[PDB]
Amino acid sequence: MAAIRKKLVIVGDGACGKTCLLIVNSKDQFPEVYVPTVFENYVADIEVDGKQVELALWDTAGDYDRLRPLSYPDTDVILMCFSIDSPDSLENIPEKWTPEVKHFCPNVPIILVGNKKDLRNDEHTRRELAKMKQEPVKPEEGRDMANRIGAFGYMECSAKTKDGVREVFEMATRAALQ
Ligand SMILES: Nc1nc2c(ncn2[C@@H]2O[C@H](COP(=O)(O)OP(=O)(O)O)[C@@H](O)[C@H]2O)c(=O)[nH]1
Ligand SMILES: [Mg+2]
């Protein structure tokens, strides 16, 4: 056994699924009834490529705007997260969110998460994004937006479906052990 202890702060706009990522990964079941603003005070255990890490998993909001700065220190990994149904949200990833880390977090890893993977091959999205014609975010459009900013790694995922969720945390593990 070991005891590697690593902070992870999840940053981003509203409606990416921050807290549905933070919860679901904990409990392994989507909050279908009610979800808070923020869900904090959580540790994941991840036994990955040999090493066992205690990956502490924090969060942020905006509703608590003046709390983003209080949560940045000691970060061993940032989860900057966007939502594929709000490509307007990848538009903030370069203005704000990256402009904030390199103030409250000089260096520090970033792993780009692209949530709401489900609202991509949907009707009501292709019917609404496409009503402002905004074709839901494609993979290589993100993947390479993550290269620009610095993301040692790229991820997308769903928390309704739960496919990816562990890798969005496991890839971070390695990211805090790199
Ligand atoms: N379709 C879909 N909706 C999601 C998913 N994850 C979260 N949501 C929606 O996002 C809502 C709230 O987003 P939340 O997790 O609070 O975002 P935050 O403000 O960024 O922390 C949930 O109540 C769901 O309606 C997902 O994987 N797929
Ligand atoms: Mg929430």
Side-chain angles (χ1 to χ4, degrees), residues 2-178:
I4 298 142
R5 324 274 205 183
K6 304 293 189 146
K7 176 179 288 207
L8 170 155
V9 170
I10 179 169
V11 286
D13 36 322
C16 34
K18 286 190 267 165
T19 6
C20 294
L21 183 70
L22 255 254
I23 302 165
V24 171
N25 174 60
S26 313
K27 317 304 176 58
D28 216 37
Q29 201 236 320
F30 199 74
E32 315 221 68
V33 181
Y34 159 83
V35 193
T37 296
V38 274
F39 169 75
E40 290 149 299
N41 259 52
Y42 188 72
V43 160
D45 306 7
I46 302 102
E47 313 97 46
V48 60
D49 47 12
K51 315 275 309 188
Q52 155 134 52
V53 177
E54 294 220 301
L55 211 84
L57 307 178
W58 296 44
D59 205 321
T60 53
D63 261 333
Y64 289 142
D65 176 4
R66 337 172 174 230
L67 263 133
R68 215 172 317 135
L70 305 185
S71 328
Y72 291 112
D74 294 312
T75 32
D76 291 295
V77 48
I78 291 285
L79 281 189
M80 197 187 309
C81 298
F82 72 96
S83 41
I84 298 163
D85 63 301
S86 314
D88 306 300
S89 68
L90 197 69
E91 154 68 2
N92 319 318
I93 294 272
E95 187 194 77
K96 198 185 180 197
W97 278 305
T98 304
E100 259 175 68
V101 294
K102 203 189 96 194
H103 184 227
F104 288 128
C105 255
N107 213 342
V108 95
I110 325 213
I111 295 280
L112 205 56
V113 194
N115 304 34
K116 278 157 193 173
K117 162 273 149 147
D118 28 309
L119 302 167
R120 164 189 277 110
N121 293 71
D122 175 18
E123 183 212 303
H124 206 271
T125 59
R126 294 213 188 185
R127 195 202 198 176
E128 178 149 296
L129 279 87
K131 111 200 330 150
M132 262 277 307
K133 49 283 157 295
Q134 203 150 292
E135 193 214 71
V137 179
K138 150 151 36 158
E140 288 92 0
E141 169 176 332
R143 278 170 159 115
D144 284 314
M145 165 69 218
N147 261 262
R148 295 167 49 176
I149 48 168
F152 155 75
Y154 47 94
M155 286 297 300
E156 297 194 351
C157 63
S158 173
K160 300 204 88 92
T161 69
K162 302 190 267 174
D163 210 3
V165 155
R166 268 268 202 179
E167 294 58 47
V168 172
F169 291 84
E170 282 166 1
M171 196 190 253
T173 292
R174 274 183 273 282
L177 278 76
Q178 205 265 10

